[PDB]
């Protein structure tokens, strides 16, 4: 059994009614259920048997559906309403989730800016380089950073977060630190951070050498 | 012949926590008193814990009593230990040991052992962050603080002491390989004033107690 | 109300074991049928075990089927997940949940879950080790074998040439979690300027040999 | 109850034969175990019910006493028995043990020998300084390493291991090192090993000057 959830991501307004779909790969009758969950708590039982409201849930939210077929509808959403929102096939002893819908505040595309940090000499003295690149206030969330030194492409030595959406402005923002011993630093000269988004009309790439 | 076979050890923080695991080859447990013992670095054995049959009677050291727990699994033949608030002198290779004989009376002493786990428990409960200045397009100019190595979370970063709030971004903090945090915390600037403001991130870490302030400079 | 609380999380190197832990209030968990749940970095949510009541039961995901063990200790009201030879996809945060209702059924939602607790695997299974020399000032010279993972390393001088004298120390562990380890042997002063000196490093987990010459 | 072994350490020879006695605080009748500890190895039960040698035990082993009062006798020691051994009251529920007892070869006292090695430029580019100092064929076991940086004494930043006895000469060698960043490292001048031992009239320093 998969359940697939659509879309992946909803952006709305508040005010708005939106819906959630949840798709079964065969029948699983009403047994469904529908979590909350907001970033670094843990998930909330909203809705279960397809349709039941958990007690002390507000009616705004309501499940329909039943088969291979089954919704989520907010209706009023309200800024305590952004999250992910996980559907679930459970049985007497096991169980699978969608693979979750984050509902976000909707906006006007937006490009990243985009800086490069070479690392500080003090860091250097102590044997290790952090270079980091920073994309500034964009939208959607997607994005997608490579490292490059001297045009080699850069895998498993960095790490990225990513903000929540920023209450003004509703953007994200994203940092990305590539990490090298002080003797890997040293054997380059070229560090390079290439950025691709949706607002761009071509990758972004910045660059330093070091010196 | 019987073996068990310890699992879980490591290196852990004061006041943390760790669970262990003991599994068998050759036997059932369900007929035994299991039991964890530890030497210490001393070189001497302590009883840690014991859990009878059906988990009828558990029993633990004083020194570990409202800080371990035992537990067993006779369908799958696994004993546990859970370990909380862990101290510096926990450290110490940990052994699952079975209370039996040939044959089974009503007190036999430790006829297997495990090969044991060593379990290392540092005195540093937290660590200070080192703090880097991400140094300096058109107007807009980016800064910020590199904010390495700390333990645990949280830290708090503001810019000016609370001045320069509009443009700021502290990350969520990244675990590193080496059990460490790590985040940054930028802001955009007008690159105008580049050479007449001084820009400050002031790094708290309240679990360690620790300020320090950074300027940024190109 | 109802809580539960996970316990065990932390940073485990790929291949390695972490045994996961959960305690409840307010409620025993006899007669539930407790599961472990796991939140990968995606953001999605991924079911990884279920125990019924009585341990009848017992039921993995397949990606981690064979390697997880989930066991349950009713008189105490506590949950367990041994995790083995993890992969860098286990990488998540793992919450214990029950299945439970006003009225339990054959078949309730996950009702109540505890926060979770943040399980992290490197990939890194094994590292090899820095040599470095202890240079003489009879005279001691040796070599420092840091920064390893895991045990075992072998130490030889010349090949095995030089056998007496030699004093290979048991390894330490670092708060790092590397080990590091000292060779030493002592030579006449009068040979350090006719013999030549070299120790070879083993470390067969990463299959990693290492000649080093100490030279004053 | 409480159980105290004695001695501590047994120092013998090759066909000796040795006791070694175990106190209970309070009667244990015959409630008694002696197990054999190789180091790095786990326990072996050689003796329960303080004189039923464990099936495979060499007849050289025998237990006895009772009550408070109980002896482990080894009559004709061999090489392989040459290590730590443990005595245990258990009960049906709990258990004690004593603090060990090392069986080791008997020599004269000797003094180590003491070296100091400053690090290698090597790993100072890296970032990390390992001061390490040798005490090299030294009897009996005990022995005190201080560190002390510009006379100060340090806590917290070395640490030590000990060679098992060696099979030649029946000394022990120790190995202790002291690790710093570059930073504080190249912060001070005198770095100094103070070891303290039986076989020495008074402590001995040994000592280098970044240079
Ligand atoms: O840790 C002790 C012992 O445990 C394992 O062996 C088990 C042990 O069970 C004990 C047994 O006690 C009996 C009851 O009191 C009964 O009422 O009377 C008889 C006769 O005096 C007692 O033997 O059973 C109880 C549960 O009813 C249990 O709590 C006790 O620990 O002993 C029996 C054999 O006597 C054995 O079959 C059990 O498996 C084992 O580790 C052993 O080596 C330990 O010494
Ligand atoms: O995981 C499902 C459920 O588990 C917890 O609740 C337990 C559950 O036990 C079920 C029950 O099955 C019944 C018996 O086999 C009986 O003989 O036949 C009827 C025929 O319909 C079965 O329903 O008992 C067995 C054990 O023998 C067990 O394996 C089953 O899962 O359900 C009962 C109530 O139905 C409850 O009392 C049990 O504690 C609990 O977590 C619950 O919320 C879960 O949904």
């Known amino acids: 059994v998969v359940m697939t959830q659509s879309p992946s991501t909803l952006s709305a307004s508040v005010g708005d009614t939106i819906t959630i779909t949840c798709?079964?790969?065969?029948?699983?009758?009403?047994?469904?259920?529908?979590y909350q969950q907001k970033p670094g708590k843990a998930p909330k039982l909203?809705?279960?048997?397809?349709?039941?409201?958990?007690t002390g849930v507000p009616s705004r939210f309501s499940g329909s559906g039943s088969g291979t077929e089954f919704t989520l509808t907010i209706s009023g959403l309200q800024f305590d309403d952004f999250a992910t929102?996980?559907?679930?096939?459970?049985?007497?002893?096991?169980?699978?989730?969608?693979?979750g819908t984050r509902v976000e505040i909707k906006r006007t595309v937006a490009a990243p800016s985009v800086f490069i940090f070479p690392p500080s000499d003090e860091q250097l003295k102590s044997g290790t380089a952090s270079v980091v690149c920073l994309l500034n206030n964009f939208y959607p969330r997607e994005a997608k950073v490579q490292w490059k030194v001297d045009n080699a492409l850069q895998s498993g030595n960095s790490q990225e977060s990513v903000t929540e959406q920023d209450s003004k402005d509703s953007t994200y923002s994203l940092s990305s630190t590539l990490t090298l011993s002080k003797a890997d630093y040293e054997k380059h000269k070229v560090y390079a951070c290439e950025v691709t988004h949706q607002g761009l009309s071509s990758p972004v790439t910045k660059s330093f050498n070091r010196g | 012949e019987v073996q068990l076979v310890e699992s879980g050890g490591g290196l852990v923080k004061a006041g943390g926590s760790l669970i262990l695991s003991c599994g068998v080859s050759?036997?059932?447990?369900?007929?035994?008193?299991m039991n964890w013992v530890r030497r210490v670095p001393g070189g001497g054995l302590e009883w840690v814990a014991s859990?009878?049959?059906?988990?009828?009677?558990?029993d633990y050291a004083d020194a570990v009593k409202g800080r371990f727990t035992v537990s067993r699994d006779d369908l799958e033949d696994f004993v546990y230990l859970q370990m909380h608030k862990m101290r510096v002198e926990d450290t110490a290779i940990y052994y699952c040991?079975?209370?039996?004989?040939?044959?089974?009376?009503?007190?036999?002493?430790?006829?297997?052992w495990g090969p044991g786990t060593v379990v290392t428990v540092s005195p540093a409960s937290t660590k200070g962050p080192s703090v880097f200045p991400l140094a300096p397009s058109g107007g807009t100019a980016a800064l910020g603080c590199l904010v390495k190595d700390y333990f645990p979370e949280p830290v708090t970063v503001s810019w000016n002491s609370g001045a320069l709030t509009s443009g700021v971004h502290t990350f969520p903090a990244v675990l590193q390989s080496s059990g460490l945090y790590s985040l940054s915390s930028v802001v955009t600037v007008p690159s105008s004033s580049l050479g007449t403001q001084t820009y400050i991130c002031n790094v708290n870490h309240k679990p360690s107690n620790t300020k320090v302030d950074k300027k940024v400079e190109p | 109300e109802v809580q539960l609380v996970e316990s065990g999380g932390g940073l485990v190197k790929a291949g390695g074991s972490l045994i996961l832990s959960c305690?409840?209030?307010?409620?025993?968990?006899?007669?539930?049928?407790?599961?472990?749940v796991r939140r990968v970095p995606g953001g999605g949510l991924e079911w990884?075990?279920?125990?019924?009541?009585?341990?009848?039961?017992?039921?993995?995901?397949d990606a981690v089927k064979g390697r997880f063990t989930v066991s349950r200790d009713d008189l105490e009201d506590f949950v367990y997940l041994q995790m083995h030879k993890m992969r860098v996809e286990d990488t998540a945060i793992?919450?214990?949940?029950?299945?439970?209702?006003?009225?339990?059924?054959?078949?309730?939602?996950?009702?109540?879950?505890?926060?979770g607790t943040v399980v992290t695997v490197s990939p890194a299974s094994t590292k090899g080790p820095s040599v470095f020399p202890l240079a003489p000032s009879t005279a001691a010279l040796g070599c420092l074998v840091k920064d390893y993972f895991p045990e075992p390393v072998t130490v030889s001088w010349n090949s095995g040439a030089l056998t007496s004298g030699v004093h290979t120390f048991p390894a330490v562990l670092q708060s790092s979690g590397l080990y590091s380890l000292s060779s030493v042997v002592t030579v006449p002063s009068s040979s350090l300027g006719t013999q030549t000196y070299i120790c070879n490093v083993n470390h067969k987990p990463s299959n990693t040999k290492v000649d080093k010459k100490v030279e004053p | 109850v409480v159980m105290t072994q004695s001695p501590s350490t047994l120092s013998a020879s090759v066909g000796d034969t040795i006791t070694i006695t175990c106190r209970a605080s309070?009667?244990?009748?015959?409630?008694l175990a002696w197990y054999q500890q190789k180091p790095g190895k786990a326990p072996k039960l050689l003796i329960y019910?303080?004189?039923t040698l464990k099936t495979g035990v060499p007849s050289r082993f025998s237990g006895s006493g009772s009550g408070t009062e109980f002896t482990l006798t080894i009559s004709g020691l061999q090489f392989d028995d040459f290590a730590t051994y443990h005595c245990?009251?258990?009960?049906?529920?709990?258990?004690?043990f004593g603090q060990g007892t090392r069986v080791e070869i008997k020599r004269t006292v000797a003094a180590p020998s003491v070296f100091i090695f400053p690090p290698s430029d090597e790993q100072l580019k890296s970032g990390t300084a390992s001061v390490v100092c040798l005490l090299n064929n030294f009897y009996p076991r005990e022995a005190k390493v201080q560190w002390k940086v510009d006379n100060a004494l340090q806590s917290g930043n070395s640490q030590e291991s000990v060679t098992e006895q060696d099979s030649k000469d029946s000394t022990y060698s120790l190995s202790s090192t002291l690790t710093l960043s570059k930073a504080d490292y190249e912060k001070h001048k005198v770095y100094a090993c103070e070891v303290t031992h039986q076989g020495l009239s008074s402590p001995v320093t040994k000592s280098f000057n970044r240079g």
């Open positions: 050759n036997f059932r447990i369900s007929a035994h008193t």
């Open positions: 019910k303080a004189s």
């Open positions: 859990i009878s049959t059906s988990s009828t009677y558990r």
């Open positions: 245990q009251h258990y009960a049906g529920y709990s258990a004690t």
């Open positions: 040991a079975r209370k039996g004989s040939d044959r089974l009376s009503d007190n036999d002493p430790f006829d297997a």
């Open positions: 309070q009667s244990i009748e015959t409630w």
